[model samples]
Target: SITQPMAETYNPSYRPVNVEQGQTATDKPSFTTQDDKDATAPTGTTFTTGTDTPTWATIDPSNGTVTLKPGTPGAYNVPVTVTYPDKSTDETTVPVIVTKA
Candidate 1:
């Protein structure tokens, strides 16, 4: 299993907190074979984003896309969560760097 960093220590509001303009941010959680073999596989994996940023920038669980319009070149951090059918979850933060178009 891949170990993830601590959640509470992660910050989602760092500078340039968005992807480069015209670019789309994609993230998929890693699941074990047990998660797929289980009869609940389809609903067992769910993705969520943000508990820090504003609502408009929050990620919707129904879709796995995080849209951003970055105006400058820099790095940004996005925190996300993965929930299993058992109700257990893990959190991860992804860093996105935007450059001049």
Candidate 2:
């Protein structure tokens, strides 16, 4: 069967998402994800994004995609969690830095 386009291991690293303070945060960043093991008929998995600062304009509850309104100049930490029907879990942290340009 088809998969979620397999990704390598430990792809969730600390990456910086630079967004201007006055800019529209409509960008939906995507990441890579696969498995340590594979199968011919592997059950599908789902992903979601978790954030402490609830200031983003639009954020999908199920998927790890979000859009932010105009925020102050600072840094925000967001961790994403992925769950599969076989494995336990996988997570990654993304640092959101807001700048003034």
Candidate 3:
């Protein structure tokens, strides 16, 4: 008899967060399926980009865009939480590498 269950999981494509300081995010992260390549955010998906230095950058919550500026080229793993339409939650982080302007 079967015991476990099968389910689909969030398959995040390789989204770039590498940017020079004082620069806004040009390309934001999007969702792609594990089987197909249809990049999109699920219906009623609420995304929240974690916050950081206000003067340096801004976080577009609805979309995954980390606008960052800084005194030095820095890198940090910023934690982000994803809330699906069903109110289910998942946690992930981005390699927010901010380089000198």
Candidate 4:
């Protein structure tokens, strides 16, 4: 038998972050893999950006933190891919909603 590493992310349909116009909001979409905790397996995790990110959004590839830049009121989506030390990957999305002040 062979061991395969797997990646997992919390809440694919994450709760929407609410903010007022010209205000910023941050969403921490964390990721993990079973092999990360195993001493015998590799132990690194990283994030890859998605195409749906809004222009007003900033993503931290190191930690998967999506911070929205202050801008007009509207809704937006942020997505990212998480890669395990073995190169296996998974994806998740975060939603953000900006309303009028």
Candidate 5:
């Protein structure tokens, strides 16, 4: 039987982080899945871009890391979908505010 995936690390709202206008900000959110108390997965967890994700932001499927590089200073909501070994999924958005250096 396949175990359901749970977004244990999913945060409804995330604290804002600072990103320089021309600099790239690398952020990692634990979208890791767990099926058991010890956290075991047959396959692995995958992260992908969700709706409204900006072009300046990119999500790493291997790990829930979002790389951001924006030309202008503004606030951006970085959304991502986390998939578990059993194919169960959930989505979350990270709010980031960029400022000029």
Candidate 6:
């Protein structure tokens, strides 16, 4: 009986990529002061981002409301990434929209 030789194949381990997404606040809205003591008006701000893995390089304020620059009015999407001490890396995406007065 004749037999055919079989070929061997090798496969490498697969690791998932880490990623984080969010937006950052830059400038605050300028409030005009009146002559009264309580003339200072209260300003509201917030930040939002997609879910991300916890990493060393990850931003301290993850997945939360963040203050942003009110002077600039526009919508923007920002991408963020975190690198682990072991040289592994992760990434995330953030969306921001600002309305200026």
lDDT, candidate 4, 1-101, per-residue tens: 17644543222224579978887778875333343332221345666668766777777777667777758777776677777667777677777788998
Runs in model 6 deviating more than 4 A are: 1-67
Q: Provide backbone clash counts, one per model.
A: 0, 0, 1, 0, 0, 12
Model 5: lowest-lDDT 10 consecutive positions: 31-40
Worst 10 residues of 3 by lDDT: 1-10
Candidate 4: where is the Cα deviation over 4 Å? 8-15, 31-43
Question: Model 6, residue 100: what's the lDDT?
Answer: 42
lDDT of 6 by residue, 1-24 (tens): 153211111111112222223433
Estimate candidate 6's alpha-carbon lDDT, on a 0 to 1 scale: 0.30
Better model by TM-score: candidate 3 vs candidate 6 = 3
Q: Itemize residue pairs with steric clashes in candidate 1.
A: none
For lDDT, the strongest prediction is 5
Sort the candidates on lDDT, descending order.
Answer: 5, 4, 3, 2, 1, 6
| Model 4 lDDT, full chain set | 0.64
lDDT of 3 at 31: 65
lDDT of candidate 1 over 38-63, digit per residue (tens): 12223535567767732334455653
Query: What TM-score against the true fold does each predicted structure earn?
Result: 0.50, 0.54, 0.62, 0.70, 0.72, 0.30
lDDT of 5 at 71: 61
The better candidate by lDDT, 1 or 4, is 4
- Flag clash pairs in model 4: none
Q: Each candidate: RMSD to true structure?
A: 8.5, 6.5, 4.6, 4.9, 4.3, 22.7
Query: Which has the better lDDT: candidate 5, or candidate 6?
Result: 5
Tell me the lDDT of model 4 at 55. Answer: 76
* Comparison by TM-score, 1 against 6, better one: 1
> For model 2, how does the per-residue alpha-carbon lDDT over 2-28 read when each residue is reduced to its tens digit?
434233343434346787878876444
Q: How close is candidate 2 to the true structure, as a TM-score?
A: 0.54
For model 5 the local lDDT of residue 93 reads 73
